[PDB]
Amino acid sequence: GYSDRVQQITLGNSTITTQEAANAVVCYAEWPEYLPDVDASDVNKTSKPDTSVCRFYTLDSKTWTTGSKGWCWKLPDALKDMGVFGQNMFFHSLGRSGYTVHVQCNATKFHSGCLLVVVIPEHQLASHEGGNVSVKYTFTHPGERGIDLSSANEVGGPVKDVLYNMNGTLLGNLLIFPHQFINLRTNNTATIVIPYINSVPIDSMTRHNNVSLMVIPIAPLTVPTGATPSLPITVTIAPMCTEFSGIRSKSIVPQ
Amino acid sequence: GYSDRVQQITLGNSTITTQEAANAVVCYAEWPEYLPDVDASDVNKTSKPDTSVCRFYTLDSKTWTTGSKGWCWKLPDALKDMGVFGQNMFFHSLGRSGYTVHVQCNATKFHSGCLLVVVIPEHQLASHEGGNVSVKYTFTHPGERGIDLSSANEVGGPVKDVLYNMNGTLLGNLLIFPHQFINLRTNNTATIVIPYINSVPIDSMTRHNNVSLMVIPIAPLTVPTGATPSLPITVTIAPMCTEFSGIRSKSIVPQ
Amino acid sequence: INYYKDAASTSSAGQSLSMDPSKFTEPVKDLMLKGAPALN
Amino acid sequence: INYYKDAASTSSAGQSLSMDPSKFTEPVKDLMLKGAPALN
Amino acid sequence: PDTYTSAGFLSCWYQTSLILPPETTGQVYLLSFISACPDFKLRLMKDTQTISQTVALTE
Amino acid sequence: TVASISSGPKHTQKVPILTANETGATMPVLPSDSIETRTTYMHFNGSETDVECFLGR
Amino acid sequence: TVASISSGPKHTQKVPILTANETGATMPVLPSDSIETRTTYMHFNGSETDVECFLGRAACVHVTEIQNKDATGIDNHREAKLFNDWKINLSSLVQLRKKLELFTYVRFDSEYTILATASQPDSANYSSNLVVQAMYVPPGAPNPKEWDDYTWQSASNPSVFFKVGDTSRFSVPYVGLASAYNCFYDGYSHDDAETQYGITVLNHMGSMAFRIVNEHDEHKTLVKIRVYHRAKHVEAWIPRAPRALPYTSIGRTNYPKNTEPVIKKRKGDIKSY
Amino acid sequence: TKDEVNSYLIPLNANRQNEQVFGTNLFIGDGVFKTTLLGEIVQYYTHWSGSLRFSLMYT
Ligand SMILES: Cc1cc(CCCOc2c(C)cc(-c3noc(C(F)(F)F)n3)cc2C)on1
């Protein structure tokens, strides 16, 4: 009696269960793996903390209301302060990792709503100022909090129009990227396994965000008559096949 | 032309060289090793950061003067703030490790002096107050700075009489413990490899110090006519076969 | 002959007859031969 | 060696060494496999 | 209970939150259970602090 | 006798830690069913908890 | 087994008696390395210096007292010594303590011998035949409060009943929680700024209560109890510097202030014989 | 204030986020565990070791 709906994911000393899943997506059908010799350039022996960093970290919950526009997190940024994973991030010159993203949101058979959960490799954001204005470091490194698409523009920050994916492309085409939907009537969780995707073997984990995770309401939230007009959304992420290289002083980053 | 005097020790991305060594001591003739299944109790899969923690960390240099009594460091305490090793120490409930201790002190063929470098397993210190007074946590956790045997007693602290090894035993018998001498006329470095020694497979690394390292002047420092009446002593320690278990919140310790 | 069921109740073990002082007398990394210069 | 004629006078029995908790832990009619849905 | 020998802590939190359906009100409860794994070992038999008496019982 | 087997990551349709206690059964769930474990041995028989020993003094 | 081999004149490049003690090693130099020797045999095995033998004899580890007297009106039986207890430890009496502390870790089975002797300091028409009850009270077991508590039922705690003037004997298996007992412990029970330091937090073996089963006689009887310990099936690790200064407390390595010099001072020169 | 069926009921509250449901140290020979079958039997011995099985049933 095994179902696409019931699943368990165990990484390190952390386990996740869901009784209302919709299968799981493995980006471009590729499971994360360590860096093979044939592709390596950096000559340093790498460090593989394994279970101390390859475990689930739960971010702060977001509140989905009738007016929510969506949220955007960036990796590895979002976990920059998570236990040993975070520490290794700043103590090493280079690093590479994959992840298992698990977005949670339950309601009742009376509610309705549909969230789009998508992973976008190299999600280079646009400046709301147009022209040739840049987007300052801090604004693409929100950390665990993430970027709230319904928040107002701010000097040095990115444009936050859900309709244009924060980058001049249409929302409807976000589906070309590995994604999954959390359709309250069907779902309650979305799971995406992300393999390391980059044009280099390994890379700086502080100055470059490999992918960004977006949770975007498409069909708006609807609650039954007289019910609390909101639902919480929780994001849990676990790094996997994490490798660190070039250990040293420990970066000091903007702000 | 290989000599007992010339040596190189490479751990992680750190290397040490010495052209005036006196062989090296391996405590009780046992090289450090990881914890084997047959001896394990704790069921958690352990974390082995390897090269990110098994590397040489150099403590702050001490100044050997004509009146120095000696110094005492405790492990893993002395490295509690050293890079990733330190972090892992506080983020895990349990841990186990071995070390390579390298004490340095050079002079000239005109100087004279003899330091005793010894490793003492379970070096339970005594309270200068006698009776049944205890020695408070902070005083046996000096960290990288270590305990200066020529400093004055302090409330809650340990007795610091070099003659009585801070524990009611005579200095001359410290040689029953794995040791080495740095006799300026012969030496300039001392090297001791310490295997994990304990009555339990793995243990808390914050509430228990497995061994303490002592550098004690026996034959006092002597400098040539009109020379600076002091010499620096440097201690470099590298953990090896380090294992961490039971990852969690991260301890908050006294002071 | 042992009269009791538990091991703890038996009498003394009898000489270990192992005796290897070297782990305390010669805990050095590089073997040192008696007669050969200690520091080469 | 037993010094007395009756069984009651002998010493303790020694570990049963059976040990089967299932008659208390899993007294269910239909076998339940660990990992398979408890209620199918 | 001995400090050096402490086992740690157990806690439970809301991952998302409890959602009740329409026409439903109040409190729902959780029942908690405890048992040992086949892992379990117990030794050095002794008297318990869970029973006592001041005088011998009579019929 | 092993106390715990070696067990690594997991991502299955087989959920050993989800049960239904109303059945009246206590499923024999082990640590290796919910966390990554290493191999360890019992080094223990349970002699002292045998009813013969329990009431035998 | 030869004690010394035959060795004659010598004139070599091989100098066995020149070493470098800074290496930390004690080269096994023999008499035949520096003088001309003849052949001799050991005729010796070293049985008596085996750790099994060294710690293998009974040593008094505790002396306590209890007394048989009318309990009527006594509000604190424990204080009145109607019964007494011993917080089990092997570092109260120094002779055995120094021996054990020659090592860092030690593992063994224990054989206990309890001797009880009576005494009647004041007027008594006879010496009574008292029976002592020694009960082991492990951590967590209910402690006796009155000499005739329900606790002395000892349904699960082990205990012996023997006559005063007689002796009690039994052995106990290695009961340490770890693989060996710690003679020293450079640590605490937890990361706390005020908590105790040393093996004091490790050696929590409960205690054993003693009492006299008999009701009181007209006179009062003082019973002194001595506990002896003998280790068997011994294992010892990490030898250390022997204790030099006197002890001051159970468990701690503390030594008294203004203690006297332990190393003898020469009645003369460094050249004196 | 007294032993009740209610001491076995762990309350859960609707629409609470992040919050804590319950907590307890793991001295199985005392506290909440003291009266359970496990705690009861465990108290007949001085030493324990092994893994514990803690379950939660939603009602
Ligand atoms: C170090 C070190 C090692 C030890 C071993 C202490 C053993 O503790 C005991 C003692 C002293 C006596 C008994 C005992 N069993 O029965 C009796 C009775 F006869 F005294 F009741 N005493 C049981 C244990 C576990 O204590 N400190």
Helix (H, G, I), strand (E, B) or coil at F55: coil
Select from G170, G172, G207 the residue to mutate for testing ligand 1; criterion: most ligand atoms less than 8 Å from CB.
G172
Structure tokens at A147: 């970027």
Residue G100 CB less than 6 A away from ligand 1? no
Helix (H, G, I), strand (E, B) or coil at C25: helix
Which residue lies with its CA nearest to atom 27 of ligand 1? G89
Q: What's the CATH number where G221 sits?
A: 2.60.120.20
Distance between CA atoms of residues A73 and A70, nearest Å: 10
Chain F partners within 8 Å of H51 (Cβ): 4, 30-31
Query: Most H CBs within 10 Å: which of E4, E17, E24, E25, as the mutation test of the H interface?
Result: E17
Closest Cα in chain F, distance from residue B238 (Å) = 26
**Which chains contact C through at least 3 pairs of Cβ atoms less than 8 Å apart?**
B, G
Residue G150 CB less than 6 A away from ligand 1? no
Partner-chain residue, chosen from A104, A108, A234, that has the shortest CB–CB distance to E19 = A108
H-helix or E-strand containing B96?
A: strand B92-104
What secondary structure does DSSP assign to A128-192, as a single string?
Answer: TT-TT----GGGG--GGG-EETTSPP-TT-B---GGGTTTTS-GGGGGGSSEEEEETTT-SEEEE
> For residue C7, which of G202, A210, G174 has the smallest C-alpha distance?
G174
**Which chains contact F through at least 3 pairs of Cβ atoms less than 8 Å apart?**
A, B, D, E, G, H
Test A6 with F18 for CB contact under 8 angstroms. yes
Structure tokens at D24: 């208390």
Instruction: Decide: B170 and G234 in contact? Cβ < 8 Å.
Output: no
Distance between CA atoms of residues B127 and G209, nearest Å: 31
Closest Cα in chain G, distance from residue E43 (Å) = 10
Select from G205, G225, G227 the residue to mutate for testing ligand 1; criterion: most ligand atoms less than 8 Å from CB.
G205
| Interface membership of D39 toward A (CB under 8 Å) | no
Distance between CA atoms of residues E35 and E40, nearest Å: 10
Instruction: Decide: A32 and A243 in contact? Cβ < 8 Å.
Output: no
Angle of helix A83-91 relative to helix B83-91, nearest 10 degrees, comes to 180
| Adjacent-strand bridge partners of B71 | B148, B215
Does chain C touch chain H (at least 3 C-beta pairs within 8 Å)? no
Residue G136 CB less than 6 A away from ligand 1? yes
Instruction: Decide: G234 and G108 in contact? Cβ < 8 Å.
Output: yes
Q: What backbone phi and psi angles, to 5 degrees, belong to B114?
A: -140, 115
What secondary structure does DSSP assign to chain E, as a single string?
Answer: --STT---EEEEE-SS-B-PPTT--S-EEEEEEEEE-TT-EEEEE---SS---SS----
User: Cβ neighbours of residue B79 under 8 Å, at least 6 residues apart?
Assistant: B57, B85, B86, B89, B144, B237, B239
User: Cβ neighbours of residue A208 under 8 Å, at least 6 residues apart?
Assistant: none
| Containing structural domain, residue G63 | 1-273
Q: Are strands A189-194 and A25-26 parallel, antiparallel or unpaired?
A: parallel
Apex A81 CA angle, A78 and A86, nearest 5:
95
Per-residue three-class SS string for chain G: CEEECCECCCCCCCCCCCCCHHHCCCCCCCHHHCCCECCEECCCCCHHHCHHHHCCCCEEEEEEEEEECCCCCCCCHHHHCCEEEEECCCCCCHHHHHHHCCEEEEEEEEEEEEEEEEECCCCCCCCCCCEEEEEEECCCCCCCCCCCCHHHHCCCCCEEEEEECEEEEEEECCCCCCCCEECCCCECCCCCCCCCCCHHHCCCCCEEEEEECCCCCCCCEEEEEEEEEEEEEEEEEEECCCECCCCCCCCCCCCCCCCCCCCCCCCCCCCCC
| Interface membership of D22 toward A (CB under 8 Å) | no
Residue G108 CB less than 6 A away from ligand 1? no
Structure tokens at H1: 């204030």
Test A228 with H17 for CB contact under 8 angstroms. no
Residue G90 CB less than 6 A away from ligand 1? yes
Partner-chain residue, chosen from A50, A83, A247, that has the shortest CB–CB distance to B91 = A83
Chain F partners within 8 Å of D19 (Cβ): 46
> For residue A212, which of A74, A76, A94, A111 has the smallest C-alpha distance?
A74
Test H46 with E14 for CB contact under 8 angstroms. no
Distance between CA atoms of residues A118 and A172, nearest Å: 12
Distance between CA atoms of residues B244 and B76, nearest Å: 13
Number of domains making up chain G? 1
Distance between CA atoms of residues H29 and A37, nearest Å: 53
H-helix or E-strand containing F54?
A: helix F51-54
Say which DSSP state H35 is in.
Answer: G
Which residue lies with its CA nearest to atom 24 of ligand 1? G172
**Residue F42: closest CA among chain H residues belongs to which residue?**
H50
Which residues between 38 and 67 in chain B have a beta carbon less than 8 angstroms from any beta carbon of chain F? Answer: 38, 40-46
Distance between CA atoms of residues A88 and B87, nearest Å: 10
| Interface membership of F43 toward G (CB under 8 Å) | no
Q: How many CB atoms lie within 10 A of CB B236?
A: 18
Select from G106, G131, G136, G207 the residue to mutate for testing ligand 1; criterion: most ligand atoms less than 8 Å from CB.
G136
| Adjacent-strand bridge partners of G116 | G225
Distance between CA atoms of residues E38 and F3, nearest Å: 8
Test A51 with B247 for CB contact under 8 angstroms. yes
Test D36 with A6 for CB contact under 8 angstroms. no
Instruction: Decide: G166 and G89 in contact? Cβ < 8 Å.
Output: no
Chain G partners within 8 Å of F57 (Cβ): 155-156, 158
**Residue F45: closest CA among chain D residues belongs to which residue?**
D17
Longest dimension (CA), chain D: 60
**Residue B49: closest CA among chain A residues belongs to which residue?**
A49
Distance between CA atoms of residues G94 and B154, nearest Å: 28
State which fold the C1-40 domain adopts.
Rhinovirus 14, subunit 4 (4.10.80)
Structure tokens at B233: 């002593």
State whether CATH 3.65.10.10 applies to domain B1-255. Answer: no
Closest Cα in chain B, distance from residue A245 (Å) = 9
How far, in Å, is the centroid of ligand 1 from the Cα of B24?
43
Residue G167 CB less than 6 A away from ligand 1? no
Instruction: Decide: B131 and G216 in contact? Cβ < 8 Å.
Output: no
Select from G55, G175, G184 the residue to mutate for testing ligand 1; criterion: most ligand atoms less than 8 Å from CB.
G175
Closest Cα in chain H, distance from residue G170 (Å) = 20
Amino acid at H20: Q
H-helix or E-strand containing B101?
A: strand B92-104
Helix (H, G, I), strand (E, B) or coil at B89: helix
Distance between CA atoms of residues F47 and G169, nearest Å: 24
Structure tokens at G211: 């009492």
Closest Cα in chain F, distance from residue D30 (Å) = 10
Distance between CA atoms of residues G144 and B141, nearest Å: 40
